[model samples]
Target chain A: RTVYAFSARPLAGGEPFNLSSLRGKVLLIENVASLXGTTVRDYTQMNDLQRRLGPRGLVVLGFPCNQFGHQENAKNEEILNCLKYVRPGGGFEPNFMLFEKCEVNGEKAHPLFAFLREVLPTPSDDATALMTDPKFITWSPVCRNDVSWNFEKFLVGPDGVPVRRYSRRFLTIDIEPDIETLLS
Target chain B: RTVYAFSARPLAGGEPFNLSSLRGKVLLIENVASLXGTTVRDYTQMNDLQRRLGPRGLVVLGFPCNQFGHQENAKNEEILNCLKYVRPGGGFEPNFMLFEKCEVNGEKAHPLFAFLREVLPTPSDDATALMTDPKFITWSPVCRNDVSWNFEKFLVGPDGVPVRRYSRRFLTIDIEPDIETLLS
Candidate 1:
């Protein structure tokens, strides 16, 4: 359920963040995109979870992906500006670290995503919380670990073991129990 | 080579661009992208070919796909603006039709590509033109018809039969020989 390591440039611009740097910490990772059904609504909860559990060694990392409906169309600078101003249509910074824009699946997908898809258990179904275009019923896993859509959640234990994975329909905060167990 | 009947919105936005409308015309269909190594290079050649051969009934259609490195990141508005400025940035305005963006491969890939792959011959190799990230290298071709990269060409002759498919490395101009024969 967990990968040995992964790394990405910061979404807001900074030094790269290495997943292995979080060696001893529990992790919850999600692919985020503003155009999708869940990301805009789930951000506050994701940010809150990261803020509350961060002190206890829980790391929730967000990676923006354009793979689904091309929602996250912004580049590095625009991405930061959009998040800082566009979401609320004024201003609101993410509490959790938002990493660079990337592909969540298919050819040329980010290596981190490749590792996750290879190591983590597959999500049960696609888009439990959202309804997307039938033209893109992406839930049919092309590979065993292929992600279905944006807002897919992956939970890692404190020991770096991938433990659980959730579909797009699964609410982000519902994983509190699992996070508590990992932290405990 | 052939695919099931399919259609798409115009790049400029409008009613569906029916595939049936192209029944009697010979076609040189390409999965296009702005961010790829060749779109800028190929556009001029593609435009030139369409301008030259279009009167003789060769329909050159461009379908922008972001599956490769998210290179076609611009929207309809910006795509046109990009074309006007970027060829300097391919080579000019498309005399032929340019369709909407769609996935060229994968579970959620557009139906048209699926049909093309199902009906057309496979490209000689994956990503012949662009040295794409290994993260992509989609040549596994789990499906015999899976396209390897952007700018992959499908030449359909009169009466709507897919004739030959070209790898990304095969220049748009190089296909002129086959197109001429088809026109003949």
Candidate 2:
């Protein structure tokens, strides 16, 4: 299934864009934040991965989010400041920001999130690891359809269908072999 | 050489503690945040790795930080929230909490941080790749010093010397081979 295309404002540059225009290109879509623990390194790896794969028609798209403990309360400027401090020499400078209201969880989640969740595999190993933990199980019933956490990434193939779903815990390198396989 | 240690308050629980007490044991120290992208899965993996290694006299010490992002704001409550949310079933949770403000950053940037940065391999792939990007070079120079970003980890041998530094972009599985190497 071709991934559903949607429009959103860029977080850093404030440019309006549409995902549909990039159809037929491999896409690495992640919900990101400036202050989150893995944000800087993850972004750095994505930038590197994009550079390696861009020639092969790959794009890494980041969506800034504040949910899951308000990790991204900073406006675009604040986010940009943090990014500049951590990853100054990375290839992909932060370009898009989704500062506007969007549903990241529950019944009102944005259409983009809801669609990805629907098409991808459910209860990834990372999600299962968390759900099995007594601490998480009691705090919230694992919402079958809810996003497990931030940095959740979807790898969309050139055909635009989600070729793979990566829990935030899976590092960029861990997926490189798979990506190489898909690209080959 | 003995690993330098310090006392600090737990960021989440505000409990007083001293890291020096764990000096004799082989320490697997992790600077962590409950709300960070991979906290749940990473914690679960750590919990499991610790369970297997703890019997062999391994110690995993977690230091919660909010500097990269405000994810570790809840203090002890957040720690408990993570425990309840991520590792309720694990009987052996590692020692954890925020360090007191006095030992958090700058000249006092946690003795462990200084030690890790000094001993671990420099120019990890992510760091090197970031340096190659012209746009990145123009924006973030601090990557040259300091911790680079949150969740970047240092593995210390039982003697308290930094053995390996794993970028936050590394998967928990990637560390297993190194841990095995360390044990041997």
Candidate 3:
């Protein structure tokens, strides 16, 4: 099944956003945490990708998450403000779509993540730590395919099928090749 | 933690074999099912690996499993006999060590597998199929990191830390380079 079948809420608050609308676009979907050390770079690079590639049919969708070390501790409505006025401040704001805070792992994880993880192999080396190390784990019954940390990304083709899964340590800028390939 | 801390019963029936005895060796541990289509090649190549590299500190350990499609249905005592007389037949026998049949997933899984899985990312591409395809799944509450199928191997170094995880689709012959590196 492709990603278009799933729907999510927008971070700024509104009616449910269905991914079906993005059927013809290459998607970079990631779970983000605004309070982590990766916040600034991830936001900046992702914003840059959107502005540079938006016309080329690339859509970056960010889902704020607090699962990894409780990093994104803010209300959905306040997330945009936090990103703009605080962490990556200097009047910076993502040109891409940001979704409501959601759980990306555990039993309560968003259906979209469950679908994504099912189709892709675990992309990080910290898999064992997530399952055994208490300091790195934040949920119960830690599964092998759980996202390693904040900023873990998933790439989807124009057809809406997931193409790759990237770990938190894989930078946003490094995804350009896959994005370009899928966009083509 | 190293594999030295674990112990398991032997397939041919004997007192518990302490893995601590293998502290100085490079280990190639796998979950195997003798009745599957892969039985012959897997056993043959694995045997070759053991014969060729055992002298250089490589020890291949096989744990008979029935989890994937109920492939290894014979009792522990009958498994070796079956491998020698049927399936791979023609007097074929695995030179590598084969442990007593055990579950590799779900609640009843062996402790060693639990440890290995907790330390390694899932190494197969069939993750989604294992979780969602009834024909591919044989366990309940399937976690993201569960071994996808029989013959999935985990390589541990001389110090006992797991070095790499290979899916069932990964050929036993392809593991030589990694084995050579560890042995050196």
Candidate 4:
């Protein structure tokens, strides 16, 4: 099934965020957290990507997750402000769409994430090593193929079919070439 | 379904090779190709592993596949002889069970492989890049997550559920500890 089949809520807490609204755009969807060391770089690069590529038919969707190390425990109302006045502070505003905080793995995971995990399971040989420690694994019936950490990304083509799944350690800069290929 | 539910034929042309026969054993199943550079080392190490661990309830099963680079051009009858007389000669012989050469991807891929692919899809950010060249992809409607290359491996626990899917570049020696963990 294509990504357009699913929907999530906008972090702004109003209308549901329907993926079909962005039918023709390439989507870079990621599970993000606020307090991790990667928080600043990921938000900065994503904002840059949205500003630069938004006109070119690319949309980045961020879904904050606390599954990894509890790095994102802020209430949804406080998330955007935290990004603006705290980490990577200085009036930082994300241009991309931010979804409501969500669990990205296990049975309670959002359907979109469940679909992505099924279509593009984790590639790491020892995925558990890259994942949260057992005590920190917040989901029941922990899956071996769960997303390892915040910033693990999925690239979806304009057709809504997922094209690639990137690890948390693989930066957004490395994702540009693929985005350009799909855009072309 | 666990691997125990599937069965294949032996290269030696005997009775069907039922996976349930090895139910309590930890298994290392791989798609092998005789003509590739990795063939010699893969076979040698697999042989070593079988001889050393067979008594410890470990079963190494090799299924030769030609889908990558058309590497196994020899007829099924000639494969064992080629391994023993030509490359990695010195009368080398695999101590592991060798199955009939088969396709490991696409519609015709054996049932067990299809099950493995579904349960452990490829993890590469650019899985196609790690796969055979397009002209050599050798399958209809080539899946984005087809086994990237020959010697790619799957580890199965005593319960028959696949534990991990390792890339072709992930050497067999590196797979030892996981095997030990499952065997223990």
Error of 3 at B168 (Å): 1.1
Ranking by TM-score: 1, 3, 4, 2
Q: Is candidate 2 or candidate 4 better by TM-score?
A: 4
Question: Against the true structure, what is every candidate's RMSD?
Answer: 9.3, 19.8, 21.2, 20.8
- Model 2 spans > 4 angstroms off: A13-15, A86-102, A121-124, A130-142, B1-184
lDDT digits (tens) for residues A59-157 of candidate 3: 999999877655664557556655664556556678889888989888998999989988885874334434334544647556778787788889999
Where's the lowest-lDDT run of ten residues in candidate 3 chain B?
Answer: B124-133
Of the two candidates 2 and 3, the one with more favorable DockQ, higher being better, is 2
Quality class of the docking in candidate 2, CAPRI style: incorrect
Residue-pair clash count for candidate 1: 9
lDDT-wise, the better of 1 and 4 is 4
Error of 1 at A19 (Å): 28
Q: List the residue pairs that clash in candidate 1.
A: A1-A162, A2-A162, A108-B136, A128-A169, A129-A169, B1-B162, B40-B90, B86-B89, B87-B90
Distance from true location, Cα of A6 in model 4, Å? 66
Model 2: per-residue Cα lDDT over A1-184, one tens digit each: 5654677666545566777888877878888765466776687788788878778877787777666545664445445544553323233365422434344555666667778877774635454543332322212223565565667878888777887778778786567776776677
Question: Which regions of candidate 3 deviate over 4 angstroms?
Answer: A1-184, B124-132
TM-score of each: 0.49, 0.47, 0.49, 0.49
Shift in Å, residue A19, candidate 3: 58
- lDDT ranking from best candidate downward: 3, 4, 1, 2
How much does each candidate deviate at the interface, measured as C-alpha RMSD after superposition? 8.0, 16.1, 26.5, 27.4
**Model 4 misplacement above 4 A:** A1-184, B123-129
